[PDB]
Design a protein around this ligand. Structure first.
Ligand SMILES: [Mg+2]
Ligand SMILES: [Mg+2]
Ligand SMILES: [Mg+2]
Ligand SMILES: [Mg+2]
Ligand SMILES: [Mg+2]
Ligand SMILES: [Mg+2]
Ligand SMILES: [Mg+2]
Ligand SMILES: [Mg+2]
Ligand SMILES: [Mg+2]
Ligand SMILES: [Mg+2]
Ligand SMILES: [Mg+2]
Ligand SMILES: [Mg+2]
Ligand SMILES: [Mg+2]
Ligand SMILES: [Mg+2]
Ligand SMILES: [Mg+2]
Ligand SMILES: [Mg+2]
Ligand SMILES: [Mg+2]
Ligand SMILES: [Mg+2]
Ligand SMILES: [Mg+2]
Ligand SMILES: [Mg+2]
Ligand SMILES: [Mg+2]
Ligand SMILES: [Mg+2]
Ligand SMILES: [Mg+2]
Ligand SMILES: [Mg+2]
Ligand SMILES: [Mg+2]
Ligand SMILES: [Mg+2]
Ligand SMILES: [Mg+2]
Ligand SMILES: [Mg+2]
Ligand SMILES: [Mg+2]
Ligand SMILES: [Mg+2]
Ligand SMILES: [Mg+2]
Ligand SMILES: [Mg+2]
Ligand SMILES: [Zn+2]
Lengths: 141, 175, 209, 37
RNA sequence: GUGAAGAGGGAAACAACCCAGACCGCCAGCUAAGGUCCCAAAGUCAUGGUUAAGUGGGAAACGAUGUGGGAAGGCCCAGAC
RNA sequence: CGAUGUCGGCUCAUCACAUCCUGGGGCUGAAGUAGGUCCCAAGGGUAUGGCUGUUCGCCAUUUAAAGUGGUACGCGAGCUG
RNA sequence: UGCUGAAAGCAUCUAAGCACGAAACUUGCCCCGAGAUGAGUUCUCCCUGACCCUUUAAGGGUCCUGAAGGAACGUUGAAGA
């Protein structure tokens, strides 16, 4: 018989990471791994065994190349002409918290379980949080 | 290459402060400061500055030459100072100064008022000729470019703001 | 800038010695009392809420009565809110008057328009009408077509068709003020303001002018 | 500024330059020779 | 040769393309095509160079002091450029 | 083909740029107004009448301009025949 | 369109750096709008009584209590199928 994970008895820990000086494509992948629980032996496809991850200094994320001017983020409102276009620097200046969220949501599976995994990311834009009551552990990338 | 290898002499009465890669120069005209690219190294021989390309950078000699030229400009501006003259040409055109601003009537309905940075000193010895003095070269070049843009010298009669040392490729209208 | 809340009474005219009959919509702006001041520390923005008029003691609810008693203000007929700028301060017990617009020339009036009910396309979006003759059948006032055949094969979002027309908040800017009567608590504004007589309107200094 | 595909030198006072990844041709004595890719 | 009359894996989806021919069951293992950052299972594998265009991830005649090289040649410390 | 209803016209629009105007610029054999060519730019606007079933087209008179094309040569379970 | 400026001793708007620049873009003008499930913020108001039962718990039942407020009916509206 193969062991499975029960959502009631599973445990989740709190980790805090600073996104200063690291890349989106090499940080969001680790975040998705630790959100899906692929770093634990108790990994199961249908159970969210991941850990609650907090991200600090999302505006300090480092990106190489000319992506700061050529990295567009297309989306559609729903209307016929409701198409919008932005760039990396505009996103950082206006809504910096929505630059890690897009990457992690794209990397995570699509569905209710993926949304539940995404619900655990407490992405902030500074160097301080209000979740000190959870006693988080500092993590390196 | 050759420019970078050519050294920079700092004359008497000039004080140099080098913290990290940042460079600050003080003296007679004023104080200047400028940071350089992380692909160059600057050394002081107690009487002359030298520049060297660092390891791990392909475009090192070009950056060193640019830094040498910038430091030479800074030291000569601090010691003597940069100057530039504008020879306004055209009927009905004049110039005036009020403290640190420039007033012009370049054939416009409204008078043209232009501000100046804190390190620029202007003078109008003649109605059709003005002069400016400063410590930096890029600032005075930008100021002259703005003055030139106000009234571009036309290729038919030369009316407009033009440099006192440049030339105009004037033409003649057909019949 | 700090606006005020008034009650629309009707439209009329005012004559000038030059021989001009300027239209005007008289607005009755009573003593507008302060109920609460919101600061940047607690609420996150600088604003002030205003109460106008009077209400029945047997009709005002207990939470409203307590909120008014916290300030020391009688029970009005409603609550409005206005944002604040730098250099503008107030207290909780103040009662602003119509004299604030003494040096104001152009104002903006915001209010709920008059409800026209479920209106047709022609009345709602100023559409045109097909011919009433030459063979037309049951399509004298219909909007006609809505889209294209199987490309996209649907209806675009934001299409203009029939629906509710009225009972919505509209703002008219740059209306010229004619006169201010502090004794009668009256404001004279040239033009036409949205809403029927007796409605509540918000008069503010012009944002652009 | 004539914009075309093939850019070259016409007179002896022309300097071919590359700015922002675009090839340009500027002559110091003939405005007609100003070319762009 | 395949489909027709052929299931399965791969090319994101895909009758004919590649690997490969389903008697049935097993929560056993080994491979081919194809892949090993995440979706999605596997190297953020080691040494060696190229690219700075997101080239990779749609295309020509043609044009360019874009660079990474190979082999030569002219002129040149009586001084070249 | 055990039916996907067809040209033109009316209402209703939407998208694109190889742009008609407005916006900015380069060259001019651009003295100025007025012009010619080319680059960027779709935010907005982009005519009324006589003839013809006609799109197209001819003419009259305006307009800052009277755009090019796609949407089953858009739109008949919206109308017209 | 430029300023300074090397690779290329010069030159050069660019490779380091700086500045100007369109009705194009984001704001700025108006409206909707926390089911924005990431379901938000603030000022207020309201009931501060006892009993037993197994399945010992986000448990079941009894008496008393029925508040703030809302709902329903009626008069109705320049609100409205
Ligand atoms: Mg009504
Ligand atoms: Mg009609
Ligand atoms: Mg009939
Ligand atoms: Mg009829
Ligand atoms: Mg009939
Ligand atoms: Mg149809
Ligand atoms: Mg440019
Ligand atoms: Mg057959
Ligand atoms: Mg097969
Ligand atoms: Mg076979
Ligand atoms: Mg297959
Ligand atoms: Mg394919
Ligand atoms: Mg498949
Ligand atoms: Mg194996
Ligand atoms: Mg293999
Ligand atoms: Mg999937
Ligand atoms: Mg994996
Ligand atoms: Mg590696
Ligand atoms: Mg058929
Ligand atoms: Mg059928
Ligand atoms: Mg038929
Ligand atoms: Mg174009
Ligand atoms: Mg657009
Ligand atoms: Mg705009
Ligand atoms: Mg007739
Ligand atoms: Mg058709
Ligand atoms: Mg038809
Ligand atoms: Mg149909
Ligand atoms: Mg017939
Ligand atoms: Mg130079
Ligand atoms: Mg230069
Ligand atoms: Mg305008
Ligand atoms: Zn030339």
């Amino acid at each position: 018989k193969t062991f499975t994970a029960k959502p009631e008895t599973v445990k989740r820990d709190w980790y805090v990471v600073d996104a200063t000086g690291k890349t989106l494509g090499r940080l969001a992948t680790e975040l998705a791994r630790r959100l899906r629980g692929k770093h634990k032996a108790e990994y199961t496809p249908h159970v969210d065994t991941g850990d609650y991850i907090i991200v600090l200094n999302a505006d300090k994320v480092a990106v190489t190349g000319n992506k700061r001017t050529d990295k567009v983020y297309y989306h559609h409102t729903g209307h016929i002409g409701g198409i919008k276009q932005a760039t990396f620097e505009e996103m950082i200046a206006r809504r910096p918290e929505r630059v890690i969220e897009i990457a992690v949501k794209g990397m995570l599976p699509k569905g209710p379980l993926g949304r539940a995994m995404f619900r655990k990311l407490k992405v902030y834009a500074g160097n301080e949080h209000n979740h000190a009551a959870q006693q988080p552990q500092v993590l390196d990338i | 290459s050759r420019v970078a290898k050519a050294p920079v002499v700092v004359p008497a009465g000039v004080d140099v402060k080098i913290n990290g890669q940042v460079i600050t120069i003080k003296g007679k005209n004023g104080e200047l400061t400028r940071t350089l690219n992380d692909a160059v190294e600057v050394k002081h021989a107690d009487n002359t500055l030298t520049f060297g390309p660092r390891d791990g950078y392909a475009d090192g000699w070009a950056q060193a030459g640019t830094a040498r030229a910038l430091l030479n400009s800074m030291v000569i501006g601090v010691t003597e100072g940069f100057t530039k003259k504008l020879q306004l040409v055209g009927v009905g055109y004049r110039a005036a100064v009020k403290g640190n601003v420039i007033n012009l009537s370049l054939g416009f309905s409204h008078p043209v008022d232009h501000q100046l940075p804190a390190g620029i000193t202007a003078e109008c010895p003649t109605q059709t000729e003005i002069v400016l003095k400063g410590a930096d070269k890029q600032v005075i070049g930008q100021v002259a470019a703005d003055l030139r843009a106000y009234r571009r010298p036309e290729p038919y009669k030369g009316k407009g703001v033009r440099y006192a040392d440049e030339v105009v490729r004037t033409k003649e209208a057909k019949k | 800038m700090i606006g005020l809340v008034g009650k629309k009474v009707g439209m009329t005219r005012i004559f000038t010695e030059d021989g001009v009959s300027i239209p005007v919509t008289v607005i009755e702006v009573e003593a507008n009392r302060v109920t609460q001041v919101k600061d940047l520390a607690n609420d996150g923005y600088r604003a002030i809420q205003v109460t106008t008029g009077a209400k029945k003691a047997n009709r005002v609810t207990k939470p409203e009565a307590g909120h008014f008693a916290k300030a020391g203000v009688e029970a009005g007929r409603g609550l409005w809110e206005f944002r604040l700028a730098e250099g503008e301060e107030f207290t909780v017990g103040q009662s602003i008057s119509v004299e604030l617009f003494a040096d104001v020339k152009k104002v903006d009036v915001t209010g709920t328009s008059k409800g026209k009910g479920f209106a047709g396309t022609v009345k709602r979006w100023n559409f045109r009408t097909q011919d009433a003759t030459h063979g037309n059948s049951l399509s004298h006032r219909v909007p006609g077509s809505i889209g294209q055949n199987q490309t996209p094969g649907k209806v675009f979002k934001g299409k203009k068709m029939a629906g509710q027309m009225g009972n919505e908040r509209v703002t008219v800017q740059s209306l010229d003020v004619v006169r201010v009567d502090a004794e009668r608590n009256l404001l004279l504004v040239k033009g036409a303001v949205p809403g029927a007589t007796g409605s509540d309107l918000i008069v503010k200094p012009a944002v652009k002018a | 500024m004539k914009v075309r595909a093939s850019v070259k030198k016409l007179c002896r006072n022309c300097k071919i330059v590359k700015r922002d990844g675009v090839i340009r041709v500027i002559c110091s004595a003939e405005p007609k020779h100003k070319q762009r890719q």
